Structure formats: structure tokens, C-alpha cells
């Protein structure tokens, strides 16, 4: 046993951080060495975008679109705020 938190893939120094993806999101982990394991945290991307699973189309952070839903029509807007969220609002015309 050698002092050095080893990740499920590569070994890094004590309290060292590294970029690793989980299922589909890139989270940077912070090893602790030992039974403390390592904690991952969502990393800040560069191509912030907003995807609409309602029409299967993609938009960029700071864009808007009009799509119907539930016998109605929602003017969903694409946001980001250093993250990447999708705000959906109603707008029956």
C-alpha cells in the first residue's frame, strides 16, 4: 500500500484533482487518499448549449424558440448562467 489516492482509472497525488466523466458529464474529482475516496464535481464547459428533448433540436446559450406542448404552446427559452439550463414558459397566442 502506497500513499496516493488511486482513481478507478489512473492514480493521482494526495488531494490531487483530475477531469473524469460519469455516464456523460465531465466532473473533476478531488482524491483524499484512503477510505475517504474521491468526490467529483461538474466541470465548467466551453460550448454552453440548451437541448430540447421536445423537438430533438439543439440551441446555444442565449437563444429562444417557440414550441407547442400539452395541447398548448410554450415559448421555451434557452439559458445558461455559467451552467446550461432550459427555461420553459407558456405563451398561448
Amino acid at each position: 500500500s502506497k500513499p496516493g489516492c488511486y482513481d478507478n482509472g489512473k492514480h493521482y497525488q494526495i488531494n490531487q484533482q483530475w477531469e473524469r466523466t460519469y455516464l456523460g458529464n465531465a466532473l473533476v474529482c478531488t482524491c483524499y487518499g484512503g477510505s475517504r475516496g474521491f468526490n467529483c464535481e461538474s466541470k465548467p464547459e466551453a460550448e454552453e448549449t440548451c437541448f430540447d428533448k421536445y423537438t430533438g433540436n439543439t440551441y446555444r446559450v442565449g437563444d429562444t424558440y417557440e414550441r407547442p406542448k400539452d395541447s398548448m404552446i410554450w415559448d421555451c427559452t434557452c439559458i445558461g448562467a455559467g451552467r446550461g439550463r432550459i427555461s420553459c414558459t407558456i405563451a398561448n397566442r
Binding site: 460519469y22 475516496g37 468526490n39 437541448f51 446550461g84 439550463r85 427555461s87 420553459c88 407558456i90
Partner: peptide, 24 residues
């Protein structure tokens, strides 16, 4: 006009834990 906001992926924190591959 009725706001809703279903968000997307507000941050993400895991806690992967695994022992060392040794002691056979």
C-alpha cells in the same frame, strides 16, 4: 404566459469509492 422551467443539470457531485486491487 406561465413560467415553468424544468432546468437541465444543476451542477453534479459524485462519490465514487473503491478499494485497492491487491491482497490475492
Amino acid at each position: 404566459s406561465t413560467t415553468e422551467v424544468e432546468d437541465s443539470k444543476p451542477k453534479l457531485s459524485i462519490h465514487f469509492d473503491n478499494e485497492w486491487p491487491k491482497e490475492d
